Design a protein around this nucleic acid. Sequence first.
DNA 1: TATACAACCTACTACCTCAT
DNA 2: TGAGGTAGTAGGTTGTATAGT
Lengths: 419, 474
Amino acid sequence: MRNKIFISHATPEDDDFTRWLSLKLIGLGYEVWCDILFLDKGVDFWSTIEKEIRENTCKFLIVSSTAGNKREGVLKELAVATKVKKHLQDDMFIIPLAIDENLSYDDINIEIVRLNAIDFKKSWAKGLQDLLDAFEKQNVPKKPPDHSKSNLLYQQIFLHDKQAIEKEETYDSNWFPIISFPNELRFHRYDWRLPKQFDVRTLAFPAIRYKEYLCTFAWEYDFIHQLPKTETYNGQESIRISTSDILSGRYDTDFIRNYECQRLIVQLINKAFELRMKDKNVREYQMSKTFAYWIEKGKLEKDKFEKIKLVGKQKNKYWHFGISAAGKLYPSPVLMVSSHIIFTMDGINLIKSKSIQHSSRRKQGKNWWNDKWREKLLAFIRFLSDDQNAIYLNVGSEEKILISNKPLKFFGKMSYVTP
Amino acid sequence: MKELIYIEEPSILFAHGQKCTDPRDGLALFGPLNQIYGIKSGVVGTQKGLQIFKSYLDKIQKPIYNHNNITRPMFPGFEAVFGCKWESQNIVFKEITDEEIRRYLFNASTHKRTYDLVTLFNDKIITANKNDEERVDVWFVIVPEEIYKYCRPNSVLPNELVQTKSLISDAQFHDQLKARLLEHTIPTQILRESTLAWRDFKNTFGAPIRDFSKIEGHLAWTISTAAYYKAGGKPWKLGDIRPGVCYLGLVYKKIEKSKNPQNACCAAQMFLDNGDGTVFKGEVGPWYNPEKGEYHLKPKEAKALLTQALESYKEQNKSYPKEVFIHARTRFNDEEWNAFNEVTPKNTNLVGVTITKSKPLKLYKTEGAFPIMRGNAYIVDEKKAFLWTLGFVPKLQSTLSMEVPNPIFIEINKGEAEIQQVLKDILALTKLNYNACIYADGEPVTLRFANKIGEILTASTEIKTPPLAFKYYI
DNA sequence: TATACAACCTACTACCTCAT
DNA sequence: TGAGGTAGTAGGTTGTATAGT
Ligand SMILES: [Mg+2]
């Protein structure tokens, strides 16, 4: 007995259509034999075909594309149906599926030139109606439609190659956890020594004006050259708030709440970075928000660090990998590092108009893939590090902030096979 | 070394209750969730605009392929996909002429130039929709480039084209067009003459100004899916959504016009399992905040909102939902939620959720050019987590975010729930965007359309429009 | 009406959308 | 796809209370 609808096709030129014809067909209730659904592995691969076209194939559908008629494997597949067109002695056994808007008479194989056009050209749908309405006029066998079969295949067959797989994979953040914080956060009732009019971001240490007290991780003694007549402040007088308490929320003063203190550390952290970068070998790109830090040309041998390439070239403009430091407290206090692409027509003289920079960044962004954006960052933070495990940031002479140079690693079972 | 859980990709359900993951593939395999009697399409453009609009209807009957048909599934042909005809033989045209275009367009003011073309189109639309015995399913606004070019704020038509000097010394035409047609409910799908005919708009070089050969079938997907949705039926449903949830997207838009810079129109969009959505329009109040750079509500308007939604819900679904999640990109102040709290039935669980796309925890896969696949999530607390609605997708074999993906901070700011369900639900909700037909929505549809919506709220403020399905707000 | 501060507003950049 | 538009977030620029005449 014979029930199938063998589909003969060129791959991958008519794959989009054959995969749509079979599956619309299979869900409609037909039995479709197609190379698309199997993953054959035998020498009988062709005999399987031949056995199936020979015996159980009720209808031979052939893709009538340009590629379909000139293709060795489909012409071989066609060979049997004409051999078995007589055996069955029904005229509509072979149905050319004219899916190609541009078939010259000459390409079409002689055997199927003669036959009747199933017209997928004008619309894929009208021809599906034409292929089935023709399946009404001669009684080709059918089951009651179960599209469930349809996509049982789609989901198991076509998607077999690429889906979520129980795989292990680790990912590296760009959050860089602070390691060590100064044992206390203290607040200086600076009073007469403080001048409000003065700006301290030239005070070479992270300082800000909170109320009338002075906030920093630099101990009162630390600002001397730019801050005279302050040997006058009692070392006791100043609040000495346990930092190891602040993260917890242990610290809540009704005079200032912890949310206030958590915000306050950041400017410092971010200022401490900004000062650290004043003296850590990288020219700075200024965005209004904060600074971006890009190593100039030639600083690393051949513009490579530890094997990575953090400066390069695009067109007539050099590119130079840059980063920023966001400091965030929560959930774990870390230094965030967003990655940038600065630009320079020459080694060390920055480009004037961002419009070019915007256009270059996007143009250059396209080259770097997930592997690339990771290494360079990691490298760049490996770059800055002033010892083996971390960076230093200098809040004061005896007080420092240490951030891990390697980001939290997240380990997740479930990943995808790489194509 | 923290550990990521993984969220199974939510399944969206198409024709015959068969559900998969890609609408494009879900529609193409089975068609739409509710197949529809054929779209009657009406046109409001130049005599050229039709030929263009007709070019597309004819074009999309045939298949149109993207550059690579894995990362972007092909578009089989309108009828094959949706099992219904969107015919170009059957067009119901309301003409506009260059004389009309030139006369109203050339005004010195952008706003007097913008507001009037929009009024031109609506009258051309409203006369046809209201007056017509014949019925049109969607009105397609085919905008000649000359309109798109000049009908926005910050676009300066030269002082050497203006026929009339400005009578005295918002303004986005399309959103306005939707906002004015808002009071009388009509589906407006707005298209650009350039988009539909993009190879007939050559530049000075002779190549096309904007060249779309890479993605041309993708366009039909977005257009037809939206057109389809506008025409009546929704393409799909969320496949496995637990019964009786209510999603409420909180939208606001600062009204700049007010001297007092706190006038901000307000809204909430109600999604269930469909994403057909219901846009509850809140009236105008002092929502913007100077100190906090945030959006917030007084209780009394907030109660009305919650009720307006609970009630329209019960009118729709015959009960009060046993769970209501309210999304916004901001935290909630305790008074505003306690306002919600009171309105709510006693046993319905109300959840305020803050989906913030800050810039945190950019996760870089250790090995391979591709990024973390979407569905990976990091759970900070029982309350707060990190969701990757973006990143590599194997069925596509492409990253949704074309660079290194930014997950989304999801905090249960107010209420109590199970963060796992939240992540899940939110991952589910990216799937519901009918208009942009893609694999997934980067921002759950709850908030996805806030910013385009925000205009439409402000653009029309006299009206007091009833709660409306999205198709009117799109 | 001085300023000692409060709270805006404004670029700039990384993303992300649509007159898609 | 991409030339667009938006949304973060700082701040310096700015518009308001305080304070002293
Ligand atoms: Mg759109």
